[PDB]
Design a protein around this ligand. Sequence first.
Ligand SMILES: NC(=O)c1ccc[n+]([C@@H]2O[C@H](COP(=O)([O-])OP(=O)(O)OC[C@H]3O[C@@H](n4cnc5c(N)ncnc54)[C@H](O)[C@@H]3O)[C@@H](O)[C@H]2O)c1
Ligand SMILES: NC(=O)c1ccc[n+]([C@@H]2O[C@H](COP(=O)([O-])OP(=O)(O)OC[C@H]3O[C@@H](n4cnc5c(N)ncnc54)[C@H](O)[C@@H]3O)[C@@H](O)[C@H]2O)c1
Ligand SMILES: CC[C@@H](O)[C@H](N)C(=O)O
Ligand SMILES: CC[C@@H](O)[C@H](N)C(=O)O
Lengths: 314, 308
Amino acid sequence: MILVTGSSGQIGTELVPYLAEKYGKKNVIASDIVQRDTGGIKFITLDVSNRDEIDRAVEKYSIDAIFHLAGILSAKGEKDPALAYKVNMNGTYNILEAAKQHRVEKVVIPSTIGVFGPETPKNKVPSITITRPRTMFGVTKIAAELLGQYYYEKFGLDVRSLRYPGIISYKAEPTAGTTDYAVEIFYYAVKREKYKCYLAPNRALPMMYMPDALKALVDLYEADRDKLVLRNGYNVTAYTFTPSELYSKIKERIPEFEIEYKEDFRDKIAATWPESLDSSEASNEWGFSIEYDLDRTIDDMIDHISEKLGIEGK
Amino acid sequence: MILVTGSSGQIGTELVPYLAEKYGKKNVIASDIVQRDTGGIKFITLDVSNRDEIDRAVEKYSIDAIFHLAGILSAKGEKDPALAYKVNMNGTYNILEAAKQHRVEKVVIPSTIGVFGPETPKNKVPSITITRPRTMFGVTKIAAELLGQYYYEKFGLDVRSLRYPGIISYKAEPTAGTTDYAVEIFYYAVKREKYKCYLAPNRALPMMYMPDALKALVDLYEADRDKLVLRNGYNVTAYTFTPSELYSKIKERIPEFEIEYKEDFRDKIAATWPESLDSSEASNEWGFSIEYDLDRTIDDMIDHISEK
Ligand SMILES: NC(=O)c1ccc[n+]([C@@H]2O[C@H](COP(=O)([O-])OP(=O)(O)OC[C@H]3O[C@@H](n4cnc5c(N)ncnc54)[C@H](O)[C@@H]3O)[C@@H](O)[C@H]2O)c1
Ligand SMILES: NC(=O)c1ccc[n+]([C@@H]2O[C@H](COP(=O)([O-])OP(=O)(O)OC[C@H]3O[C@@H](n4cnc5c(N)ncnc54)[C@H](O)[C@@H]3O)[C@@H](O)[C@H]2O)c1
Ligand SMILES: CC[C@@H](O)[C@H](N)C(=O)O
Ligand SMILES: CC[C@@H](O)[C@H](N)C(=O)O
C-alpha cells in the first residue's frame, strides 16, 4: 500500500495515476488537504501538520510506502513563511516519525535545487556542495534532506530523496512556484498572446519534463539498496535554459507570439539558485536517465497545450 | 534589557555574570527550565519549547536582545533525538518568531562544529563549506543558522551566530557531553586518579577556553550590524588537540596521571567532525581574537580546579 501526501499538486496530480498504473489502483491512496479528481483512486483528507491524522491514515490502510509531496513551494513560502515552516518542517518530521513508529518500509521525498544559495557554484553543481538556502522553502527542504538521512542512519528507516529542478508539465497548472513561467509561456504561445515573464531574460535554470520527473522518483523508490550511497539529495536535471532561450525556441514553432520582461520577487529567488546541475551520482547509483530532451518536451507541450485550449480539436 | 535562555548551562553559568559586569546588573535577565545560582541577577523559569512563555517574558521585561543558549547537545541528542528536535528546532523557531513579532532587536545564537559532517574537509575548514550533519543536534543547529540568516534577510531581525568548537571551563560542571572529556580529564588529574576517556586517543578536535568563548560571543554581539557579511556560521577556535595530546601535556604538570581509552558512541559523533577550523572570517569581520593558548588554559584549569 502506497500513500501519497500532497496529491493535488503539480506532481501529485500525475504521480497518483502513474503509481496506480504501475502497482494497481487498489494499492495507492491519494491524500491532500484539498481534494481533486483522482481518476477512481481512493482519496483521503490528510493534513501532514497533524500527526494524529497521519497515524490514523497509516494504521487504517496498512501503509508500506509514502511519497511525501505535501508542502509549500518557494514563491508561496515567501508570501507566508510561517505556513511554509509549519507544513514543510513539522509536516515532514511528522511523516518521518509516523513512518518509523509504524512499519512503513520506505519514505520518498522530493527535494529541490531550492536547497542551494548564492555561495553554491553556478555550473554543473554536484550533490555534495554548499547548501545555504535563502528562502524559507529552501531552509525547510535542506532540513528535510538532513532529517531523512538521519532517520535512516539512526533508526534504519529507508528514506530517500532527489533534488528536482523546475518541472514542466501540462496536466496540472502550477501556481505557487518560481519556475512556473516555463509552463505559463506555452499557454500564451498557443494563444498567440504576449507573455509577461517575471524572470530576467537571462535567468538560467535547470529544468526537466514531467514524464522524466515521474520516472526518476519511482526509479529512486525502486532502487536497489546496495547501491544507494548518497541516498538523500541526488541532483537530477535534463537541461538548462533562460527565458529568452525558451521563448526563442518556442518561436521556431509559433512565430506569432511575443514576450516582455517584468521581473518580480521570484526573479530574486531564482537568482540565488544554480544554473545547471551534475546528475552523475543519480545515474551511477540508481540508473537515473532522461528520455525527453528540450526539443522533445517543447513540441510535446505545444501538442497537449493546443488540445487543452481547443486550438486543435478533439 | 538582555534575556539569556538556557542560563544554567556551561556557557550561561558564566555568561550571565559576564554580561552583568559589562552592561549593568539591572539590564540582564537569566532564564532556564532548571534554576541555579545567578548571584543576585534576576532569574525566571522559561521553557523555550513553549512559544507563549517566550512572548510573555519578552513583553513583561521589555527584552531588547536575546542570547539564545537553550538546547540539547550532541550526546544527549543521540540518546533522545525527539527531545533535541523539540527543544532545539521548535525552541529556536519560537525564539525567532517571538523576537520578530514582539519588538526584540538582537538575537545571538551559539552554533557548533556539530553542523559539519563526514564530507566536510578536516583541516582549516572555512565557514562556507559542506554542512551535512549526522546528529539530530547538528541537524537542528544548521537549521538554526539558516533560519537566523533568513530572519535577518527577510524581516531585518538582527540574528548573529558563531560556531563554537569544544569549550573547556571550570565554573560549570561537565555534563557528559561529547567534548566534555576535555573538562573531566582535569578533575581526575588533580585527584591523581586514572581517567577513562570515551574519545579515541587520536580523535583530533578544535577547542577553546571559556574566557575566549565568552569574549567572542560578546564581541560578535557588539559588532556593528552593517559590517557583518557572513553574519551567521562564523567558525571560531583557539587550538586543535587529541585526547592523548592533552593527556601528555597535563602529565608534564602532574606526572602521576594515568589514562585509558574506552571509546563509545560519543567517539562516533566526534569522528564526523573536522579536526581544525579556519577562523579568519570572524577575525576580519568582528575582531575575533584568542588570549589563551593551550599551555595557558591547561595551567589555568589545573590552578582553578585545584584551589577548588
Ligand atoms: N513542481 C516542481 O517543479 C518541484 C520541484 C522540486 C521539488 N518539488 C516538491 O514536490 C512537492 C510537491 O510539488 P508540487 O509542484 O506538486 O506542489 P503544488 O504547489 O502543486 O501542490 C502542493 C500540495 O500541497 C498541499 N498541502 C499544503 N499543505 C498541506 C498539508 N498540511 N497536508 C497535505 N497537503 C498539503 C496543497 O494543498 C497542494 O495540493 C513539494 O514538496 C515540492 O517542494 C516540486
Ligand atoms: N558548551 C559548548 O562547548 C558548546 C559548543 C558549541 C555550541 N554550544 C551551544 O551553546 C548552547 C548552550 O551550551 P552549554 O554548554 O551552556 O549547554 P548546557 O548543556 O550546559 O546547558 C543547556 C541548558 O539548556 C537547558 N534547557 C533544556 N531544555 C530547555 C528548554 N526547553 N527551555 C530552556 N532551557 C532548556 C538545560 O536545562 C541547560 O541549562 C547550546 O545552544 C549549544 O548548542 C555549546
Ligand atoms: C526548483 C523549483 C521548485 O522548487 C519549484 N518548482 C519552485 O518553483 O519552487
Ligand atoms: C562542538 C561541541 C559542542 O557541540 C558541545 N560541547 C557538544 O559536546 O556537543
